[PDB]
Amino acid sequence: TLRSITSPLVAHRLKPIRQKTKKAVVSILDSEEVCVELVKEYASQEYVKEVLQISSDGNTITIYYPNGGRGFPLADRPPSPTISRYSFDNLPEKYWRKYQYASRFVQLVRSKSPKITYFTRYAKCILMENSPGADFEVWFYDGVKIHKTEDFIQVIEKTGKSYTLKSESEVNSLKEEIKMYMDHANEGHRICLALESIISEEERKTRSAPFFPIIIGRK
Amino acid sequence: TLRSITSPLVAHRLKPIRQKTKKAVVSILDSEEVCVELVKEYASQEYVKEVLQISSDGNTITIYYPNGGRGFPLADRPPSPTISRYSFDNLPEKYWRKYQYASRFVQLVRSKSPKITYFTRYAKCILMENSPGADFEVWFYDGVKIHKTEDFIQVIEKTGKSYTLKSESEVNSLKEEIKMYMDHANEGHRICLALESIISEEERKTRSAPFFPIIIGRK
């Protein structure tokens, strides 16, 4: 089953981007739908063999084959439909691998799209959109960098010494100066998840324009 | 009683500013305390006769008289204390008028200090800090301006026609095109007060760095 290998992608609140690759284009549209165009070259020009349109929740997949014959020319935007409609769990295996391409893209975009920026007395924290276990960067004013992933934890020092850690396994053992930074960065993390939760809940009820991205505080 | 004429001022979250006037300096410090320096000129130079330091909540007033004799020279910052301490309700009448000077300043600063900026599909709304009945500007993307005070309501049109209204007394009667804008601006207002309320409540519990100013959304 497809659900056993990935979760449906979520493109809500992500800025539009049309990213070209050698055999394909993957796109986050204005509608927040995620589009993947399959691209083949013939006669020294590039065409579009099939299109996978995914809804903003990755539940609905629309698929069409534009026809020349046999295809449509590459453009600044995706071809108009002229069609098969699936739900995530009824998507046939031949398309899974492609969906994972779009899925894997969104996931990466999400991990770089700030969701909550928060300014403390010592640092500008940034909770990213790749929930759950979203990336979390703490850019201290004094120059120190910290970055948290679901797995590992990278630290940089003013000096620029760059290094990384496992799941807090190595946590206790560190320069207690560093102990000071990580505590404060974890304080920020608790704060940001709380803010995420309440704002999310109010957004759930409100139903109009998004409450993220969000910058909070100053200095 | 002083409380019968004004409320204690609140300087929380307001950016520092040292504003000179002809007979005085009024200042919002880094500590968020609000300082008023009384200034007199002698011998072609300016001095400082007395200083009124007010806590960030306007409850505590510290008052001193720096001595030359008879005074201290004007500076880039307020004179250091060398003193009388009052609480708002025990402040003697001779100082009320001065406190109202600082009070009236803060109030004006508050009315221009954004608290929540919120981006909709049609406009960037801005709830200001002068609570309650805080000023509320709606800057539509298409050019239209709207501004709400506790009393009156100013509208500008793309054309730049500038005009104002009483307490919605005149509300119903307007170009229904204008009816469209005001409804959406009032939608934003409901949203911003709700966000203010929940974020405020979480801030009340959290107790660390401020949750305002705050920018919310995009486009």
Added chain:
Amino acid sequence: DDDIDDEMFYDDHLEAYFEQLAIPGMIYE
């Protein structure tokens, strides 16, 4: 001690400060 109740403070020094505060929402612009 002549009184200060008179004093007018909103000058162009201030307008600039006010300018500054709004600058931040000036981000998608």
Added chain:
Amino acid sequence: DDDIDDEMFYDDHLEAYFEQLAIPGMIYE
């Protein structure tokens, strides 16, 4: 239809986009 699972997408076109997203918090700087 040779497969796309290969495709590498994170290029400098993207880095810029990523740049853009972080630009907004770049306000007190």
